[PDB]
Amino acid sequence: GPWADIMQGPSESFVDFANRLIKAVEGSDLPPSARAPVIIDCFRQKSQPDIQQLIRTAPSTLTTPGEIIKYVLDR
Amino acid sequence: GPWADIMQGPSESFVDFANRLIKAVEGSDLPPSARAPVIIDCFRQKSQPDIQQLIRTAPSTLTTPGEIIKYVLDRQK
């Protein structure tokens, strides 16, 4: 898919990474109901390694992208 | 998408529900890499309400449908 080579660059902020990813996911042919899960999955597997680890520790109640973004920024 | 009306019936096992969901998701035109995220999101949204609660407390390291299925079976056991 068109968001698939998107990964957080070594000097890229999590915000800027997130924006690129959300734009590419939303601009794709995915059904809308698939966007947020695809987005969160990409946060988990495509982020900088310390962010991937940060994300691993996050309550699984957090199921919107906004909440994961807020969770990462608060640390 | 074609999996969007699939919900766990009041006398349907979680395994049987999961199996219909997985089949609908696999035969769709979702990118393969979107299947696991979508299936798990459907488990969260469309399962029987006690299964949903069970899943609410599952570790977020359990990211394959298969692991969630095992976790639900292990927790009812």
DSSP string, A14-30: HHHHHHHHHHHHHTSSS
Q: Is A37 close to B37, i.e. CB distance below 8 A? A: yes
Beta-carbon-side half-sphere exposure of residue B56 (alpha carbons within 13 Å):
11
For B55, nearest residue in chain A (alpha carbons): A60
Other C-beta atoms closer than 10 Å to the C-beta of A5 total: 8
B6 close to B20: Cβ distance less than 8 angstroms = yes
Experimental method: X-ray
Q: Kindly list the structural domains of chain A, giving each domain's residue range(s) and its CATH number in brackets, ordered by start.
A: 1-75 (1.10.1200.30)
Separation between Cα atoms, residue A9 and residue A27, nearest integer Å = 21
CB < 8 Å & 24+ apart, contacts of A27-31: A27/A2, A28/A1, A28/A2, A28/A3, A30/A1, A30/B30, A30/B31, A30/B34, A31/B1, A31/B4
Length of chain A: 75
Based on the number of CB atoms within 10 Å of its own CB, is B13 exposed (0-12), middle (13-18) or buried (19 or more)?
A: middle
Q: Distance from CA of residue B29 to its chain's centroid?
A: 18
Alpha-carbon torsion (A36, A41, A44, A45), positive or negative? negative
Length of chain B: 77
Q: What is the resolution of this structure in A?
A: 2.0
Nearest CA distance, A11 vs chain B (angstrom)? 26
* Closest residue by Cα to residue B65 from B3, B22, B25: B22
